[PDB]
Design an enzyme around this catalytic site. Structure first.
Site, PDB file in Angstrom:
ATOM      1  CB  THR A  31      76.555  87.097  78.893  1.00 41.81           C
ATOM      2  OG1 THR A  31      75.314  87.249  78.198  1.00 41.81           O
ATOM      3  CG2 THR A  31      76.655  88.132  79.993  1.00 41.81           C
TER       4      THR A  31
ATOM      5  CB  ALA B 123      68.439  89.993  78.741  1.00 39.07           C
TER       6      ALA B 123
END
Lengths: 196, 314, 240, 225, 201, 229
Positions: free
Chosen positions: E1, E49
């Protein structure tokens, strides 16, 4: 780690905090404020684990402001210290312990300036000068050397600058800037941030 | 003001006093108050109205002779302004007006006064304001229950008030119609006014009106001439049956069957008749063994088989 | 004048050995609109007369889905009805969840009986003033179950509740022999005519005011509102 | 509803108080009732600061007012905690009104018996004035009064409140004085004034501070004649 | 990420990769790692997430409730604080969340960073995620308050591109958002190949 | 109107011998005292209107709101004091947001009024609500009685004289009615029942359409409207 410092004078209390808040490797914010204003003449400093510092400081701040609104007179610094100590000690054996290290500095009209120290264990002690963090290990000797009970506030500033110079010279963690404030019977008064 | 006009009195063998006289003052008031009954003049009229209203409610319980003939002329204006319900949002002029109407209505009248006050009531009733018509009905209700014996001694009064109640029973507005029905129920209950064959045939004719059963699909914003007549007829029957809550007379069973006929009639007639029947059922239940004897078996089973429940049931 | 000491609360027995409050609550279901439930050998139907406060008003929902295989038609208090519906829906869902099985109707009405009985014995909790016709298909076969505020429940070839139920009861008891061997459409027609028995002569059954709820072995419980009921309605002969 | 009537009568009996809204200022005035020969006037306030940015004036029963004030103070602080922002005057009004319609612990006098004027500055900075009722209905006003004689004051406020009156902040203060002066005949020390003065905390006026304002309007009253 | 955001004069920028990985395997390359809290706010996905998604959706819930009750759009600071409180309620229970809450408020453009650790801070610039370090470098080199809008867009694309080039767990498509005083927009979303083809020459 | 009373009334949780619950029926009778409001359901959209009844000029007109927004696609109107309603309103808002959070879909007006009635059960509660909003089915109007029962209505009026307005609504209403035609109609009804000259201050009007969200007509918009009639 975050660095705090407190210096007590006859008519004043001098405090500084590093203004860096960081992740593991990188400093996200170069202007973080670790100084919280409980009252007009009282400042609470907090360093420790992320989140716990903020939540605890806010809770104490609100309870103090509440005392002021309810009763019409601000608390004594001694009293606010004991209140903070009570809360933190209660949280120690609770499910959620706040890991924080504090300096409570304030001026009283009756009792004059005071400086308090509180560790994460919430033991309380009043000292002429104090510090938190790894840098405290370095600067306490400086303080012991050049301290007097009768320091003029300009001299206290010079002393503080010497301590921060020790930090910049030796202490591994970069601490570029330290915000500074002075407590007086007049009130809390900001000062030019010592920087390098 | 009350203490000013107190010295003027209608007591027997009283010379006209030199003190201030209430009729001239009310004449001045009415003369200034005509526009309400310019834009800037209207507001001054309202302020004057407030003051004189306070004067009236003060002089309600103090004056030796209440209801001076001149001050009755203000009642049209007090009527139209007054509210149809009790609420605090009205800005409190209307609340004062309602209090004043109630207090003045709870006041004795001389025998010579009642034709005059009934003429005023007739005049305001033909006024457009449906609020005004509701107010005249309720004012009439209490003002009749007090000095009923005066009204009873005057037969022309009973005739006029009967005509007015039945006339407003047929008014376009549903609120004033239901209020007229309630006033009629009370007048019947006290027996000040008594139903008879004329009232019964009048209500039966008004109920026996065929609805249009049609509407303009392609394109009044007003109700209609048929259904209001139907509603007024059933309202007459309802006032009659509610005239005697705790006892059943001989005509009431037939009237009840006639009501049960219109139970399926379209609204507002349905809501009206359902309410009346529910009230009859709750009131007469206490001594239903005594009441049923008056009834026939067919009447009894028909009344038992009535769906008069409110909407929330089911 | 004839105020009765013992009808004040449900917990109070009368010296005549009756609970006036329970009797009165059973009186309440008659306030509602008429509804008819009947069954064939393999089908069960619920035919109700929905009514409206006004012409603009759409109509009240008498028929309800408890589950795929069970439906009800409410009479009496709609609040009490909705409470019962939620309880029954949750129970049926629990049964499907746990046992992978549809809930038996006899079992469901028994639970309703317990839940309804509880207020009768407790001060300050008024009885459920609602009467239901519980219809569904199970392994045993189609069933029609009546319940009342008294918390008693019955099993019926057919039953009608609400205002003017008696005339429908008479027609139904007259033709109950015929209903059993009847096909679906004929059974629906019988129910419609019975519902018509309660109606006044001025009123006539319409698409809007009629609601048909029907279940079968191969057919889930459905509800037909206005258009969906029109085919069943059209065949029905004119009233005498 | 029946308790509400008693509560409304109680607040009707109580000491008069007013509030006004101005562009950079809001003023709150309450008449200081005489207490006794020997009582000390300190304990009686009739004014309370729920927060730095909120002030309140009540009319009615003092004890119930104390309870309300404390509960609202703690709510103000908790909202500051959760939201990190100053509480909105509408919000705290909604809470105080909402507190009225919980109740007493026994539900006795579910309306606590005060209609109060809540005044403050929004976080954005817009001035706000509100009131509450024992019923729980709450409204906003350009200016209002409560307590005894409030209705007469509202008529005076209705005409006197103008853009010209509010154009000067000191005039914004003086208008409140005139409103109280109609309500209270003492024409002097029997009055308490508090001003928020946008972006600073509530500053109660000194007795000399009110005195000169009273003199100025008294002079202006002289000047008209 | 890799996600980043910075405040400049015209408004706030938010940039993020689309890669989502469980271990070495890339489950999804098309994930929208920026969350539309409401038409006036944005959220950013990092760490867990699912955790970030759920808690941000719940934040949107509370913000809409506040909007309806108070008839005012909530402050960015308030939302950041509220989220901080919610996560701090669960501290030490294994939540992994890091996010950047972006909106315009009465105060001005707002950018706040929030972590499962409990940190809440405002900043002119921020980055969060595995490639956050590499993003910090380029954006800190390129950043000023006085940037032109297109220059900011390009700078964000550079940052995300280089951070992806270094970091394994970042990749996919840059998704770029600009929060304006009126409301937010999606300026563009570009696949990494097009970016590399552009910058290569 | 002399005293009409029976022994069985005044009991909160007692069935009368007829079966009626008279205490609560009376309580419903009182709840209808509120301000008059009208709601018109059309293919084009839903038009809600209500009388403001402000006491004084000093009062901020926006401060009193007799129409509220449960959701962007929903509008609601109440009669009587707002305070009794506020609980129901909060429940409606929080429920629709529960629906959005859980299902990422907009809650239907039928579901919303259903959930409010589910609150109302779980006292008479002294409020009448008229939910109006657009949904996937289309524009819809649902009237929730203070009994708690909820029904779809092509048009409905609530308040002091809901019945009198309702009869007018019967005559004027038709399915082909446009939202604009409904607005002009609804204003006519309020003029009659109020018996006062309509102006921006004494009413609040709102609408919902498929194209747009809940929009409360600003003072300028209301001025343009009343001037038309």
């Amino acid at each position: 780690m975050e660095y705090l410092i407190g210096i007590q004078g006859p008519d004043y209390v001098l405090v500084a905090s590093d203004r860096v808040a960081a992740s593991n490797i990188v400093q996200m914010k170069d202007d973080h404020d670790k100084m919280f204003k409980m009252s007009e003449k009282i400042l609470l400093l907090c360093v420790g684990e992320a989140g716990d510092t903020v939540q605890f400081a806010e809770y104490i701040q609100k309870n103090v402001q509440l005392y002021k609104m309810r009763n019409g007179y601000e608390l004594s610094p001694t009293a606010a210290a004991n209140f903070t100590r009570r809360n933190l000690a209660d949280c120690l054996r609770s499910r959620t312990p706040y890991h924080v290290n504090l300096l409570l500095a304030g001026y009283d009209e009756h009792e004059g300036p005071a400086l308090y120290y509180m560790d994460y264990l919430a033991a309380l002690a009043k000292a002429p000068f104090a510090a938190h963090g790894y840098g405290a290990f370095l600067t306490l000797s400086i303080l012991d050397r050049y301290y007097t009970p009768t320091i003029s506030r300009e001299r206290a500033v010079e002393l503080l600058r010497k301590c921060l110079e020790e930090l910049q010279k030796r202490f591994i963690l970069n601490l570029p800037t330290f915000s500074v404030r002075i407590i007086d019977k007049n009130g809390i008064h900001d000062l030019d941030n010592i920087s390098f | 003001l009350t203490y000013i006009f107190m010295i003027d009195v209608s007591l027997p063998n009283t010379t006209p006093t030199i003190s201030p006289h209430v009729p001239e003052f009310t004449a001045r008031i009415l003369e200034k108050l005509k526009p309400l009954m310019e834009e800037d003049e209207r507001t001054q009229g309202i302020k004057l109205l407030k003051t004189i209203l306070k004067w009236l409610m003060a002089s309600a319980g103090r004056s030796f002779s209440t209801a001076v003939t001149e001050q009755l002329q203000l009642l049209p204006l007090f009527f139209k302004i007054a509210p149809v319900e009790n609420d605090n949002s009205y800005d409190e002029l209307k609340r004062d007006a309602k209090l004043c109407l109630s207090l003045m209505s709870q006041g004795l009248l001389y025998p010579h006064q009642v034709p005059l006050v009934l003429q005023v009531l007739k005049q305001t009733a033909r006024s457009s304001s449906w609020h005004a018509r509701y107010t005249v009905l309720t004012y009439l209700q209490t003002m009749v229950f007090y000095n009923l014996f005066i009204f009873l001694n005057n037969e022309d009064a009973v005739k006029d008030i009967r005509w007015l109640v039945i006339s407003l029973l047929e008014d376009e507005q549903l609120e004033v119609r239901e209020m007229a029905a309630t006033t009629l129920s009370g007048l019947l209950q006290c027996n000040f006014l008594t139903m008879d064959s004329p009232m019964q045939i009048h209500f039966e004719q008004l109920c026996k009106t065929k609805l249009p059963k049609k509407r303009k699909r392609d394109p009044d914003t007003i109700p209609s001439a048929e259904l209001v007549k139907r509603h007024a007829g059933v309202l007459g029957l309802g006032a009659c049956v509610l005239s005697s809550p705790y006892d059943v007379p001989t005509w009431m069973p037939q009237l009840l069957m006639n009501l049960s006929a219109h139970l399926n009639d379209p609204q507002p007639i349905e809501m009206t008749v359902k309410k009346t029947l529910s009230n009859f059922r709750r009131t007469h239940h206490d001594n239903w063994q005594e009441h049923k004897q008056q009834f026939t078996d067919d009447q009894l089973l028909v009344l038992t088989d009535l769906l008069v429940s409110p909407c929330y049931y089911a | 004048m004839f105020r009765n000491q013992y009808d004040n609360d449900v917990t109070v027995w009368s010296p005549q050995g009756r609970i006036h409050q329970i009797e009165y609550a059973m009186e309440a279901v008659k306030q509602g609109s008429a509804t008819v439930g009947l069954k064939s050998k393999t089908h069960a139907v619920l035919v109700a007369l929905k009514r409206a406060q006004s012409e603009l008003a759409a109509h009240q929902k008498k028929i309800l889905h408890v589950d795929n295989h069970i439906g009800i038609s409410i009479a009496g208090l709609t609040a009490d009805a909705r409470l019962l519906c939620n309880f029954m829906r949750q129970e049926c869902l629990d049964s499907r969840f746990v046992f992978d099985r549809p809930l038996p109707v006899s079992r469901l009405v028994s639970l309703i009986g317990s839940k309804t009985q509880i207020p009768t014995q407790r001060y300050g909790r008024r009885p459920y003033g609602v009467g239901l016709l519980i219809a569904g298909y199970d392994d045993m076969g189609p069933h029609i179950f009546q319940t009342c505020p008294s918390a008693n429940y019955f099993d019926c070839r057919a039953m009608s509740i609400g205002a003017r139920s008696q005339s429908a009861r008479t027609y139904l008891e007259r033709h109950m022999s015929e209903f059993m061997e009847c096909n679906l459409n004929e059974l629906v027609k019988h129910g419609l005519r019975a519902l018509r028995e309660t109606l006044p002569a001025e009123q006539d059954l319409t698409t809007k005011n009629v609601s048909i709820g029907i279940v079968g072995k191969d057919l889930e419980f459905t509800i037909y509102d206005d258009d969906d009921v029109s085919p069943f309605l059209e065949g029905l002969e004119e009233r005498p | 509803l029946f308790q509400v009537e008693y509560a409304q009568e109680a607040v009707k009996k109580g000491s008069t108080a007013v509030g006004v809204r101005g562009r950079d200022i809001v003023v709150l005035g309450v008449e200081k009732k005489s207490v006794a020969k020997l009582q000390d006037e300190r304990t009686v306030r009739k004014i309370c600061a729920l927060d730095d940015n909120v002030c309140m004036a009540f009319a009615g029963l003092t004890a119930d007012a104390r309870i309300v004030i404390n509960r609202a103070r703690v709510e103000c602080q908790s909202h500051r905690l959760t939201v990190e922002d100053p509480v909105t005057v509408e919000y705290i009004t909604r809470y105080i009104a909402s507190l009225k319609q919980r109740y007493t612990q026994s539900n006795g006098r579910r309306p606590f018996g005060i209609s109060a004027l809540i005044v403050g500055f929004d976080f954005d900075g817009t001035p706000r004035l509100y009131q509450t009722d024992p019923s729980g209905t709450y409204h906003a006003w350009k200016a209002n009064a409560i307590g005894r004689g409030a209705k007469s004051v509202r008529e005076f406020l209705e005409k006197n409140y103008t853009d010209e009156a509010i154009e000067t902040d000191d005039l914004t203060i003086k208008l409140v004085i005139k409103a109280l002066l109609e309500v209270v005949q003492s024409g002097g020390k029997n009055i308490e004034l508090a001003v928020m003065r946008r972006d600073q905390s509530l500053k109660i006026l000194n007795p000399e501070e009110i005195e000169k304002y009273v003199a100025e309007i008294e002079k202006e009253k002289e000047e008209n004649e | 990420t890799t996600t980043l955001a910075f405040k400049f004069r015209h408004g706030v920028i938010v940039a993020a990769d689309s890669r989502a990985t469980a271990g070495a395997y890339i489950a999804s390359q098309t994930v929208k790692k920026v969350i539309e809290i409401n038409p006036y706010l944005l959220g950013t996905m990092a760490g867990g997430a699912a955790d970030c998604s759920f808690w941000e959706r719940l934040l949107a819930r509370q913000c809409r409730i506040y909007e309806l009750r108070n008839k005012e759009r909530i402050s960015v600071a308030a939302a950041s604080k509220l989220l901080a409180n919610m996560v701090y309620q669960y501290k030490g229970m294994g939540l992994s969340m890091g996010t950047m809450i972006c909106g315009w408020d009465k105060r001005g453009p707002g950018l706040y960073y929030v972590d499962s650790e409990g940190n809440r801070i405002s900043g002119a610039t921020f980055s969060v995620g595995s490639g956050s370090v590499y993003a910090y470098g380029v954006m800190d080199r390129g950043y000023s308050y006085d940037l032109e809008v297109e220059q900011a867009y390009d700078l964000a694309r550079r940052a995300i591109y280089q951070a992806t080039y270094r970091d394994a767990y970042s990749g996919g498509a840059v998704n770029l958002y600009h929060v304006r005083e009126d409301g937010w927009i999606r300026v563009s979303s570009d696949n990494v190949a097009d970016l590399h083809e552009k910058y290569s020459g | 109107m002399f005293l009409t009373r029976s022994e069985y009334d005044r009991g909160v949780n007692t069935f009368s011998p007829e079966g009626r619950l008279f205490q609560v029926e009376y309580a419903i009778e009182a709840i209808k005292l509120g301000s008059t409001a009208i709601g018109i359901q059309t293919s084009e959209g839903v038009c809600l209107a209500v009388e403001k009844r402000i006491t004084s000029p000093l009062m901020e007109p926006s401060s009193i709101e007799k129409i509220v927004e449960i959701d962007a696609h929903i509008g609601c109107a109440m009669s009587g004091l707002i305070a009794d309603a506020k609980t129901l309103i909060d429940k409606a808002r929080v429920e629709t947001q529960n629906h959005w959070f859980t299902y990422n879909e907009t809650m239907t007006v039928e579901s919303v009024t259903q959930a409010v009635s589910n609150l109302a059960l779980q006292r008479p509660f002294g409020v009448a609500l008229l939910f109006g909003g657009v949904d996937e089915k289309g524009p819809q109007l649902f009237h929730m009685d203070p009994s708690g029962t909820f029904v779809q209505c092509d048009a409905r009026a609530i308040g002091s004289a809901s019945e009198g307005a309702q009869s007018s609504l019967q005559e004027v209403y038709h399915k082909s009615m446009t939202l604009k035609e409904a607005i002009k109609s609804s204003l006519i009804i309020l003029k009659q029942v109020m018996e006062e000259k309509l102006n921006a201050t004494n009413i609040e009007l709102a609408t919902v359409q498929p194209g747009q969200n809940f929009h409360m007509f600003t003072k300028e918009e209301l001025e343009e409207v009343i001037k038309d009639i």
